[model samples]
Target chain A: SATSEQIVDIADASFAPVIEQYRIPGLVVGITWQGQHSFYATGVAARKGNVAATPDTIFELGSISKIFTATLAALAEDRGMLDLDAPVSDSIPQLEGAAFGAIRLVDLSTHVTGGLPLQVPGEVGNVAELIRWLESWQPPQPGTRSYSNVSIGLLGHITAQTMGMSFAQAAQDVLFPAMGLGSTYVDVPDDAMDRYAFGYDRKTDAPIRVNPGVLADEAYGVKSTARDMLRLLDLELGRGGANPALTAALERTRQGQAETAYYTQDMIWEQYPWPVDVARMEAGNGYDFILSPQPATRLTPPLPPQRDVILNKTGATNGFGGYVALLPGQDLGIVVLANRNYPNEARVRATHALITDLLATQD
Target chain B: SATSEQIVDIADASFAPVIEQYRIPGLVVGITWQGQHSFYATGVAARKGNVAATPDTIFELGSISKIFTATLAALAEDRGMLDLDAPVSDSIPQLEGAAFGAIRLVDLSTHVTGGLPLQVPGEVGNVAELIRWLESWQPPQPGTRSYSNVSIGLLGHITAQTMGMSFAQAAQDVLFPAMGLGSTYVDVPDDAMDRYAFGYDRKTDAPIRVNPGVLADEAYGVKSTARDMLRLLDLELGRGGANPALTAALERTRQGQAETAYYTQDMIWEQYPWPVDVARMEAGNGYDFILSPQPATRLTPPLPPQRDVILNKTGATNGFGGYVALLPGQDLGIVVLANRNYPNEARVRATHALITDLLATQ
Candidate 1:
């Protein structure tokens, strides 16, 4: 059975039109179907450099960086460096006596820090300013799901603090190597700079990457190749990894903590009922879902890790767009990385259709 | 003579109404007239702490930081640690072979770096990214004055490099001490933290201060008191300073290098012609002067330091507003520092009126 070659054929049909229609600089798509991995790439990594896109070309993961942060948080918990249920102030002493100090670490990874802004204010420059601002912070919503970079970024910050490293170091030196990921980086080393794709700004079309901002190291600051990220999904699906602590940590990321009207919010991942279609996936990842607080029901006991569900996350910066979707019972996942920040709907439509087609091939 | 008390009386009349109308937390006014110094303070330094505003209360100086950077650059020059006319690449080797590398150091201080952006892009996190961005940068309006934090910030960065210190360290350890500015700081120490005023956001009115950003150390990152700043103005007026290098550096900061329609632009000061009134001063510091590039005639020999002029600079962060004006010809100057970022127009109006009343008393 030509299943591996068929996966490539299905990805081409799904992604080639997307690359052409959006004028994307490059597109790298990785498919893991029934435990087999197939990769495909199209277009140039950089329009100016004329470098061809490859599975190895690195693209900024944007909010997908939150997934790694969530994974690291879980690892910290298993290693006894973190207590997810404990107040974040336990790790960061400066936060003690502040309103932000009282929020549990678990709530941060689940986007439930009462209510936090989408990002830390630009004026918060150092530890002193960050603490001062956080001290003054009063949440608008008391107990609701509000998507936030601030919440997760602080989680990553505290996670690294427990490990005695910077967020980048903790993720790159400890987490990445522990997971056998070599190409992922928060600060791309000089040797790997050549393969780092230039993300073209969605509005200006200028080459851009994430600039340093308050807590960017924990929020939207990871860069990785389609290959490395696909391997992460493979590990998430319980495929190839022997480290028990990490295995349990990855399992913890998939357990649903809260449920919105459209999807269950796991750690960084948006989970939908099994048999999710393109429209349902798009709605779950829509602007309305992210830009405002949504009423959510907390799991009395978190909906345990499930095989009959679809988990997905979309990430973007000014210049790059990425989407990862996983269906564990089907043993199927797709990772789409693009150099240009394209519409989430486009990524969702193509990825959903590709997963649908791949399922048909099995039948 | 009752001149010193009258100065305080005059300052009270000028600034009291301003503080009330702006709902300012506090204000500290300093007056240096004919070799005498007078200070007046009113309101609270912080709305929450109920601390009194005083001559010693520290306030963030916003863009006023650039004046100190300019002073440090001049010191670097006078000590032969820097060459203002040399390509900045001499100090920052990472910039070599890049377009930004070839620009003269003096152009950066003068806001004439061939149209650098207002700030370094937010996504530029580290030195490698900064250099990469510089290499790819193409100026939109070459050889034009475009007021920029990136330009002045880079100047501060390079200035410190020549001295083998961080920008904050060089400003705090060498430049401030040499100028006899004991209370001035880029990073306020523990002992001075109590004196630091919380800046309030102009719109939100919540307490805030300058957050760190690239080049903030040299661009908009200074905190000082009315008394310390008054001493700085006194030194600028050629009073009470004997250190030859610092004296020369102060003199260099006032030399005009470019003339716009309304004022001459020195290192950081915006200079107006003598006998300048409130309208003229306001026009020279208006948004049009800062938000867009205007046609400016470069002084071929650079305008010499002159007593017959009104020199001033305005600085603001989210929470604080400051204005300093000096009229060396009349041996008069004023320092206005407030905890709230009120309108610059309000600052200009009250300060001009105070100076006018003081000149009459003289």
Candidate 2:
């Protein structure tokens, strides 16, 4: 009873007035360890309306949507839809003259292709302008981790062109159905309105929501509820779900081709080692990792951290927030969603706090 | 049990997977009828994350924020900060020699000034360009319900100027707090990023949010959760807190200066008389009203609707939808919010249907 109460109390403090502290409208949380799952839903769905936040309300997963795109690219690679090592220019001849033609498709998916600015500049609002921008845009050295939206969005876009469909259609037809994520969407539909929730800014006086910046969907366009998020985390942790191909795809997404530090990012996920120092992982996910100019391509591969791995991602939009992470050694995971685009380190600490306590309790 | 079960079934149908047919991340609905209040949150908060819709999630109030601005203007008027009938030129001096130099402030809030088009052209992004745009702008004979954001936004901007604060700060520091709303915002900050919801365009895949199309703040920039929206509706219906100044401001916002068939609008709210037919209300909210050229000035005062009154407003953003309505006659109201920049009629109908059901059930 004491332990249960302790977990409840800790969770409540994180869930309560502090959330009210942020102008958060609502939130849902899911945590797993040893494949045991528990969920918490608090707050309201619409402050003026009749909805209450539930684990089922879909919230935007932000850049974590990148992993799904990586999975898609991986699946396409397996199907011979595209070659991971080939230049993306092979699939979309339109990019032949652009700076992208020389980069391997795998590097693009891995974030090691020379850097792209965090956002596409406004001058390139249309496809023609975008092509020109891509053509003239400088590329970071060919094999450095730039950690950008440019790679994933264009990777997904080129993946789609090779598959003969738009990015939204491609995900809907292939990736989503394959993963059994019927609830996920790139283009969320209307009748689904009842199941959707509004994201709030995370302060007492914050705005309701803001834009996802330019080319929003490719890097962070996925919207999913916590139920499915844990389903994802669990599947990735090798606890449940089957479909050898899908399992293979999941494994491929987590393959670490480049190491950046206390962090190793494969596809879209940035990973931390077991017994990870919170501050190191925090710095890895903080503004530094996001805002740092592209690092030089390393000749010596990063020595893997001498610990089991924990893969994590944090996502946000104008009005919503999301963070998801899983530990394969423990076969444990956690996901947090709020209407506000809450920070990733906050997510890291919150989930890590739970896992710390959870590990102790289980032991 | 039977009654609630029935409600659950009907409600379930509305929230079923079929809803996935429409591109919405989530939604919330609130209803209050004859003192009965019920809230329903359905679906997911995002297409890929693990979250659920709830009645408390904040949403973009869009033009619905206009009411708050109108309230702010009214409060300033109550404080003698400005006069409704005075020319805006007296305060700003900047508009002198401009087409707007002679317009009265109240006419601007009521949308009766000649049409400046539904939006500020892109060339007018900042105040200087706005001044220039206003200077060259042709004034329609002032006095008709044109339903344009131009007048309302400008009115609020000037009101904030007179109040000695930015439009965002004035709303945050004075207006919303006065009304007891802490979850409302204008230029939402980064830390508050988590709670903000995304808005989507309807039908085809599109993001409905746009640059506040000019003077963005005074009209459609307020982001709110339905919690505050109903708090507003409830207060207006005599069911809630005591703030004499805000109360007066809310009443002023609903005071109609003109009427069209089956409709009346004041500073921001659309007013409906009782014995209201749902169809008439729907037609009144249709795009025709929003898009039709500004009406000729009412030659004679419109005859009020024969029924009691319902006060209401609608809001939107690129990916979110919001609507609020309250019936003073019935002490009843409804609020609807969704991640999709949903349709105006559907919002009206959703509330109307709940009211119809409440009226019968009560």
Candidate 3:
């Protein structure tokens, strides 16, 4: 096998054109294959001066923060602190309004509840309003799917509450250590502000900086270097070198409880690229990380006998930054961190292309 | 004053209970008094049984919904459109990539110039991305206030636009007439909804229905009682009335540009209503209506020297709705509307007690 540095050289060569094409200021790409870590950093931290990017630089992993929320939920379940099947009301009894009384934790995590139209309904000025909204929330009609940040965010909150720790502390004390990821954090500590990359919205030539407050924190707040993210992927792929409980927790997230093709692919992929065969070809797929038996379009080609079973989740917020794709099939994972609002399609295609190139070399 | 039944008894006083309580399904309250109109609504409108609210019901009001857009500019330049002092290029340029280029007619309305936060930054969605974000856009420096929907919505659009035709006609051709609001419009239309009453946020023990999409209507898509709102207010308030061109042309809006204590009072009352005298009271009066001075607080103490000389403007969205007051020295002008949400303190105090009882009756 090539050394980690050699693999990084190839990855860096592949990424050069993208950097030049978009005039992207900074990017950190990391790939781990067959026990080798290939990581590359290109461009300056800002356009004004030359600040060399490093492997330790923190990038906003956007919606990929949900993966951490999911992981935390699984960890809570493993510790017997939470029962996914039980009603959420059992835990936070204060939530007593309309439909929330009967909603189970599993329903919220899997996006199976009917509730307010997706997205925070009104001008959500503060955290107190958010809490009021959650307490006053009514579940959407049963069996209908609506992807919501409120769901995953509430999951993170409930997990923290059950563990008697803050969401940030809980991740550092339990999740990071278990996954063998030393650098990942739910909330960026004040000390790490220097290493944090400033995110930009590139829709304009003179792109504007995104404030860190844009993300509500628990939903899309995790900041990690590509190296730490790769460790997360390795753990998901049963390679983080943790104990059986940790490995079990990682594998549990892969269980296909329900399909989310329509909402996840249709709504989310309008901006970002999703990896389901149906989604790639037909323009739509099932819910988060689940495959839809039928495609959105009639012309969707049949899946090959040895299908690509990819378990993945992607995240972005107006703030704290964008992130992780845990592609399990190729024993490969690619983590790309950028401080700008990079198009989801461009990011997904670029990451997939890099991973495919590495897989071909192994073959 | 006549009895409720004799003077202007609304249809279905039993329904009035629902309307007053905000339990009537699919109702929104849109009101215009003293040359300013505001849109607000409540409840959901899917289908019958789940019957959608009437035209008077409140909806999102989307972007064209607020009152601060062009109205403020016109009010700022009460003299004339061309004489607003600062050049368009000085604050915002019409030409792209050019810093403060020569201004155009479209520049002021669409916010082509004047740097304000237009949309929330993050993932760019579609063609409307730039326009959607103009609300959040802010100028690099705050010398001259830019023409932003954020500011513009606070002032109605077309307030600074050209004259001659009428602001109502401009918004109607683009939005209403097609939406089937005979009495409902950005300013005011021909045939209003019905049982036009003060809009409330929180109501008790009734099925109050708020107008859906009234606010989402470009400019000010309002909902009013069929006869009371349409015939009485619209004829007087709507475009094409005897003086349609007067108010609808954004002239009345231009008359008052000086910010007063009334503007501040309305804003403070909307967010936090603890003591009548909060931070805004100490510095200045609350939001004003039209181009006149109006009182902000609902104080029962002896009135100030200029208490009746107040001008104001008020509006509501989903849970609550109301209008501004421009008091020409106790001659008194007030507009109020409501839908069931909670705590109808501001509208009640301003319209009923302050203006009607104290100012108008006095």
Candidate 4:
């Protein structure tokens, strides 16, 4: 068992070089193992005044918010307010005649929606425009994995509809509270504004944050702290199961539904075989896997959840980058959040190196 | 006698930490010992586009330029063009009737004027205005050492007058070339512009370079590369004294004329006792020593140059910082140049640490 001091030392050696090499303004790394957690924060929260970054600094989660949406859908299903096998129209009746209305709730969360665009169309801003676009829209191909925000956003929207509120409201009032995530939010309130870090453009030095767009609230809208993310990892590893229903939902999110050469596609997380290397991790999270359609085979009756694997997700906006990975079998996990939107390869390389170090200490 | 590879390993360990801690954009460090030289360049020349910094990249020398002016003054004296014991009237007749005309030429380079401002007055833009200002200027306390740019700038101007040309032209055409410094410049030429690094404000990300000001050409204006500076260090250490007259002048500048508790003030350099520590170095180059009046004793008959001492000078502008140090006794020296104008203490601390490690290797 690595003590807290050992973890901090390992993190500093592994993370500081990456921070300096990548020129990130600030970053906070969190690690959890053997039911204990440690955090290491470096650099500044904002370059203007050079406020020191803290473990509690709020960072934009980007598409990592998809995992929360998936959890919420599963949670609603567990509570008998939703059905995973039914069409999304069963919750949002207005989409009854639309082509997208036929996508199964399970398929929406797994990114197997025949084929949806990465985002809601520019002209489709409101609910009515979205319905109209969906009615006239057509899928590029059927039943292959296409990583997208629209598919998960619609799942979150339907989950919110079943809960009788907006996605942001449901996330704030019900799902996040259920998961004991006190510092995570779909819309960061005024009280927490001071803790939010300003992300800078690595090449231009321009400050940026996420801009509001259609379904953005349900897609890449959550801001969280390293502490909160670590707790989420802890729950995913089945350490803190105070809320049985929420725990079940989290477990459901890890179930593999489709298979690719690199990893299995879960609700929103990508699960790779245990003992993964940095090269394989880089390829699994590479640009082509995210932007282009990849051939994947559907798992019959869905692959059951297993402990001997690495479940991970990456999130990025124009200004911020984040990564979360956990090895349930080894009882080890790590989260890396940076204020600059650097390459996913950089984030993965840094995290994978740190994970490798953590693995060595286990023996 | 450490090999070049050993020097690089030591430099990387010592310099990389300081670069990371200070968030400096780019720096080039040059060292010369035992008739050999080495350089280590780190970070980017500019933040945008991330051009790799190289040893040949030109950087503002800031007040380190004062050494060159001091050398030129001594050179003029060695060539019988000027006399150190004479007054300002000998070269510039315009100040013949003024009080400043009574001050000796050596006193100007040694900063022993009753007192001179650190810079030419903001309103004094031309030589006519500068002369008028100098004529009416009175020393608050005569014969006390006070560091000043006005003092050194006037010496360079006087040296230029004796040579019958502008100070900038004299530096580019006569002094630098004589020293075998081909990449140095008073005004950087058009062809070398691409190799010049853009200095950045540490507090703000604004790009900056030296702006033209009164006597700026003679005061804080030389730009040079690490390679050229290494050659200058070689000449200073008596390795490449190709020009006999220039070597004589260089030897003349090493004479100590004023004594402070921390150091002996030479023509434009500060000399400390050999085997010095970082604390003493920091004190001699601290804020109070540079900005405020300090009690210093003038060396009677001027202390003759010695071999067992450390000679150094620091230079800074709004955007660039530099330091040059050499141990004539130990045959070791270093030059540190950075694109950001950080604190003098930081540069001293970093250099001192490296020097300590180098001393250990010996």
By lDDT, who's the top model here?
1
lDDT of 4 by residue, B56-82 (tens): 888889999999999999999999999
| Residue-pair clash count for candidate 3 | 127
Better of 2 and 4 by lDDT: 4
Model 3 TM? 0.49
Top TM-score model: 1
Ranking by DockQ: 1, 3, 2, 4
Q: What TM-score would chain A of each candidate receive against the reference chain A?
A: 0.96, 0.89, 0.79, 0.96
Q: What does candidate 2's lDDT look like per residue over A21-42, in tens digits?
A: 4556677888765766677788
Model 3: residues with Cα > 4 Å off, grouped in runs:
A20-23, A48-50, A92-104, A114-116, A123-145, A172-174, A177-183, A205-215, A241-245, A259-308, A319-323, A327-330, B1-362
Compose the digit string of candidate 4's lDDT tens values, residues A1-363.
767888888888887877877788999999888788899899988786788888899888899999899999999988988888898777767679876778889888888776678877643434444665577677787767788888888888888888989898899999888878878987666567667787777777776666656678888989899999988889899898548889888888888988877899989989998887778889989998878777778887888887899989999887888999989998887888889887888788888888888789877
Point out where model 4 deviates above 4 Å.
Answer: A1-363
- lDDT computed for candidate 4: 0.83
Clashing pairs in 1: A125-B212, A211-B123, B200-B319
Candidate 2: give the TM-score of chain A: 0.89
Q: Judge candidate 1 at residue A84 and give its lDDT.
A: 88
